[PDB]
Amino acid sequence: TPVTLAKVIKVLGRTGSRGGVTQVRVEFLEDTSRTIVRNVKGPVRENDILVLMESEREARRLR
Amino acid sequence: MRAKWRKKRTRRLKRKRRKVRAR
Amino acid sequence: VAMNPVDHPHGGGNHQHIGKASTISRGAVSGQKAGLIAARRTGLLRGSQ
Amino acid sequence: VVDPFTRKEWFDIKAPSTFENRNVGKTLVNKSTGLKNASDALKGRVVEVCLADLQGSEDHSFRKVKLRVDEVQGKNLLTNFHGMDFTTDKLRSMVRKWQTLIEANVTVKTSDDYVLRIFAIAFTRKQANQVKRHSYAQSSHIRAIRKVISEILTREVQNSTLAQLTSKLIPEVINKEIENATKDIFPLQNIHVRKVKLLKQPKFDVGALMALHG
Amino acid sequence: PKKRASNGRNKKGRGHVKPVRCVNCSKSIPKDKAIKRMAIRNIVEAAAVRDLSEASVYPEYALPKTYNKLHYCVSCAIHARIVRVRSREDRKNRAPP
Amino acid sequence: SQVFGVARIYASFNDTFVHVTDLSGKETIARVTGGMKVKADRDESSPYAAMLAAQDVAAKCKEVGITAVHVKIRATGGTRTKTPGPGGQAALRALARSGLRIGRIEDVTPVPSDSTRKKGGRRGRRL
RNA sequence: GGUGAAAUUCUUGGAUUUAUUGAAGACUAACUACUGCGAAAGCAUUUGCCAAGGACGUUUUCAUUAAUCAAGAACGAAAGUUAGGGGAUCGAAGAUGAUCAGAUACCGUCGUAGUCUUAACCAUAAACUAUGCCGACUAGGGAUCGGGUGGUGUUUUUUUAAUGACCCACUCGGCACCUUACGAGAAAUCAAAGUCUUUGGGUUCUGGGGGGAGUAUGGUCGCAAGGCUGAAACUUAAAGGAAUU
Ligand SMILES: [Zn+2]
């Protein structure tokens, strides 16, 4: 059951119809230097870890 | 009312008047 | 169709008409074939032949 | 219920013999079992190979040499020149606004009965110390350039046994012959052959194919 | 009235320009009138190139680009392309981005 | 040192093919597509389905023997969009990040030299 | 496949995808421009042939031969009509799937006629620069073509180069233009729409409130579709142009 923990390094405004989703940039704690863009739902500060069930797919804005 | 379809309507009833008058 | 029914399989009637299908079988006997022998189709086609 | 990759033998793709790397890759064929020999299926197999990979250098990166598997001699699968072409996005980078493209195409023969169609592209260079924002050539200058190119591409042929043409396409010498034969008319930057076709070939001659080894 | 000194067009000295199909609408529009813009991009996006290079053979990674001139009709362009219908003042400003 | 193939990423709109072939292109190694991996379409040429396709074909490519792959990214071509679909940038990178080796990336979109009449009409799609 | 989403659609007798070829008929992408030519319509692959044409140069020639033009003529997009080829793609009609309240439309898949071609017609387009032509005068930058000077600029090698071309600066003639503005216009605006109550260079065509109406009729031409010319009765106080809030 591989879940990947990744700390956020910068937050980038908010996507979605409303500001329900926040576009964030994460750095993988495991095997770091890998920076990926990702969507969240709830309130995000910096230094907060997110649990990815897929390290692969990138993130786009929710038009 | 479109000055094209107005014109087409006139040009149809003219042709159908030609075919009526050829009798 | 303009003959008497003796003379042709199209003859007779109080109107000139074939009466039955003019498309005749290939297996129709030598004497029965009058109209269109083994007609794959009939009628005037649209576009290209 | 098959997964036929079990019965698929790998063969030895050799690229004789003018290019440095005489070894390219490996092509798999359905195994030579009942009544269908491998040869039948692996004959006429056009494998494109990038001339960068085929000569190591990155100056040969905008070139693809088509190679057809032709011979077998006791399980020895060697290819031969089938066509040269430019990369689909170097060709498109050389094309640019405020220039003039010139396309010369000649349906030439060779010393051997090889009907080759050689193309060639040449763009107009705005000369150093120019305040005019484009390098547009005149129709007469382009007619004169096409003539020059056409008779050079035909002069470097009747010689050139396709093998000699291959060995004179690689080192970019037709390019820097046409350069000096056109500079008397127009600057003309980026002279390339860009493409060669084999429209028709002679009878096989396995001697002509096998003289490209050892 | 007459909106433009041009005609949202170039055709001055010519009788008829051979037309061009809009990239998305498919609408045929005379070439001179058609909103042309070169779409030059890296083959691989500006997020993938790290893992592309590290898992690629041939160090120095030439990374060839892609080139295609997008021809757009006027209505397809007004869908938030570089058009953003500007004031009767700023209509005349020819200078690109 | 590494056995080679061709990726042939036909990323159109409405679907993505990650059809890995032999060098010559005579032999198919694996032809998984975007729509195979999600049975509720709405999204066939999507980055997610393209990544899934790329992961499956790559895994198959590791089993069958080929180690590195040349990439031939392809749009519809013909008279249509002629721009690579949104699943093209997924299928490539996903080929690499699976563990396959990638190289000689070059776009083979069949551009017409002086086209035929494009589908639609004079006024085109009205919407 | 195709979509905002789908469904018709074809597919395991392996469709879609891949490759090696072959065929057919269109089409001339990128270069391609505030760029060229042409009476307008139009005209962008290559080479060859046949004629033509402006511009420039000209210490050539003729010597008013000219400008514009009722009647009268030639060319005239697309569609359309005849009859032969041709028919790939796309697509009026039609079939059909969606949407819809209905939607015989917009979207999807097919799809005859349709011309792309040869001969013969038709003769209209927002055929537009919605600006007649010939002529004179009134005020910055590029760029096409020709010519004149200059650079000890580049290339030029067969010894120095004879040059030639490309390029640079100044210069004109004509061209397609564009940027700023004293005059003009109801204004939008402009190289002519200026030289107009301080009203006259030549000349052809057209209009007189809105409808009815580009209709009826009569000729005329056309295979037909239609084209040219073209009214009135009656009706109505506005219709319209430009700019402002
Ligand atoms: Zn459009």
Of A61, A15, A21, A25, nearest in space to A40 by CA: A21
- Domain spans, chain F: 1-127
Amino acid (one-letter) located at E50: R
Q: What are phi and psi of F109, to 5 degrees?
A: -65, 120
User: Where on the phi/psi map is residue F81: left (φ > 0), alpha (ψ -120 to 50), or beta?
Assistant: alpha
Q: Which of F38, F45, F51, F92 best probes binding to A when mutated, by most A CB atoms within 10 angstroms?
A: F51
Of D136, D147, D62, nearest in space to D98 by CA: D136
Q: Is the dihedral of CA E53, E57, E60, E65 positive or negative?
A: negative
CA of D147 to C1' of G20 (A): 35
CB contact under 8 A, E62 and D58: yes
Determine whether the distance from the CB of B15 to the nearest atom of strand G is below 7 Å.
Answer: yes
| D144 nearest nt, CA–C1' | G165
Neighbours of D154 (CB within 10 A): 14
Pairing of strands C36-37, C23-24: parallel
Report the Cα D199 to chain-centroid distance in Å.
13
Q: How far is the CA of E85 from the centre of ligand 1 (A)?
A: 16
Of F51, F47, F112, nearest in space to F82 by CA: F112
> Which H or E element spans position E65?
strand E65-72
d(Cα D42, Cα D32) in Å, to the nearest integer? 11
Within 8 A of D50 by CB-CB distance, chain F residues are 70, 104
Helix (H) and strand (E) counts for chain F? Answer: 2, 6
**CB-proximal residues (5 Å) to ion ligand 1:** E 22, 25, 27, 73, 76
Of E51, E21, E48, nearest in space to E33 by CA: E21
d(Cα F93, Cα F89) in Å, to the nearest integer? 7
> Which H or E element spans position D30?
strand D23-30
Q: How far is the CA of E4 from the centre of ligand 1 (A)?
A: 21
| Structure-determination approach | cryo-EM
Amino acid (one-letter) located at A59: A
Within 8 A of E72 by CB-CB distance, chain F residues are none
The contact set of F with E (CB < 8 A) is 2, 68, 73, 79, 81-84, 89, 92-93, 96-97, 99-107, 109, 111, 115, 118-125
Strands across the sheet containing D121-123: D101-103, D121-123, D189-192
- In the DSSP assignment, the letter for residue E56 is B
Q: Does A58 touch chain E (CB under 8 A)?
A: yes
C46: Cα within 13 Å, side-chain hemisphere: 0
Neighbours of B9 (CB within 10 A): 11
Determine whether the distance from the CB of E36 to the nearest atom of strand G is below 7 Å.
Answer: yes
Resolution in A: 2.9
> Which H or E element spans position F49?
helix F47-64
Within 8 A of F3 by CB-CB distance, chain D residues are 10, 25-26
Determine whether the distance from the CB of E84 to the nearest atom of strand G is below 7 Å.
Answer: no
Determine whether the distance from the CB of D95 to the nearest atom of strand G is below 7 Å.
Answer: yes
d(Cα F1, Cα E83) in Å, to the nearest integer? 53
Which residues contact residue D23 at a Cβ distance below 8 angstroms, ignoring those fewer than 6 apart?
Answer: D12, D13, D14, D15
